[PDB]
């Protein structure tokens, strides 16, 4: 029931469970319950938050694992974000 707030470069606020946000080693290091991302835009940060949910829901579970989808137009910025966030 503990939540954290992740802010995108354009000012979007993403409220996610603290457990889910700890998926990122960088966020885990920075944590406090708020982190601002000066170089991650909302369209990438929302996708990163979808990954945190996906990882936590399916890590060590037998309820068939689906593919994590990535549209071609977001792939490059999402790769840059994944590398910076360490997840």
């Amino acid at each position: 029931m503990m939540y954290v707030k992740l802010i995108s470069s354009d000012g979007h606020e993403f409220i996610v469970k603290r457990e889910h946000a700890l998926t990122s080693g960088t966020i885990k290091a920075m944590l406090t319950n708020e982190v601002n991302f000066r170089e991650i835009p909302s369209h990438v940060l929302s996708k990163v938050c979808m990954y945190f949910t996906y990882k936590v829901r399916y890590t060590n579970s037998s309820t068939e694992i689906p593919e994590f989808p990535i549209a071609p137009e977001i792939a490059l910025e999402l790769l840059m974000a994944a590398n910076f966030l360490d997840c």
């Binding site: 037998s62 694992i65 792939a75 490059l76 999402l78 994944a82 590398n83």
Partner: protein
């Protein structure tokens, strides 16, 4: 001589290779010298009864990209004894990849390897894209993990 190899047994083993992943699966048998031998592929969401032997070693990959897949929640599969007309199940599934590895997969599928250097990304990510999923490098790591585990 290589630790990861099939046992030269003669007791047959009927196994069901069940592909519960969205990928086209390449089954890979490690021969008696631990060399990986590719076998016929498995379409997504299908099961096939195959003839193998006790102590034989298998791993499973994406037939197109060689991305590593899981079998019974792990990396290697070994058929056991058929307990009174009962085929063994090798449950092939999609791992939960890291967001970084999943992104590298998607960028590799979209860009030719000769063009990786033309992408506007940091220097270290070019090396990451070029470090393609490889069965031999994964066998080198699994051999090192076994050497550590038993110490």
């Amino acid at each position: 001589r290589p630790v990861l190899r099939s046992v030269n047994s003669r007791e047959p083993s009927q196994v069901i290779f069940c592909n519960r992943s969205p990928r086209v699966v390449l089954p890979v048998w490690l021969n008696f010298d631990g060399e990986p031998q590719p076998y016929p592929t498995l379409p997504p969401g299908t099961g096939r009864r195959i003839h193998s032997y006790r102590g034989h070693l298998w791993l499973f990959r994406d037939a197109g990209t060689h991305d590593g897949l899981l079998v019974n929640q792990t990396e290697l599969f070994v058929p056991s004894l058929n307990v009174d007309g009962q085929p063994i199940f090798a449950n092939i599934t999609l791992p939960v990849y890291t967001l970084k590895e999943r992104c590298l997969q998607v960028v590799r599928s979209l860009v030719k390897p000769e063009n990786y250097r033309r992408l506007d990304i940091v220097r270290s990510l070019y090396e990451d894209l070029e470090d393609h999923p490889n069965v031999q490098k994964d066998l080198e790591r699994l051999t090192q993990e076994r050497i550590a585990h038993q110490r």
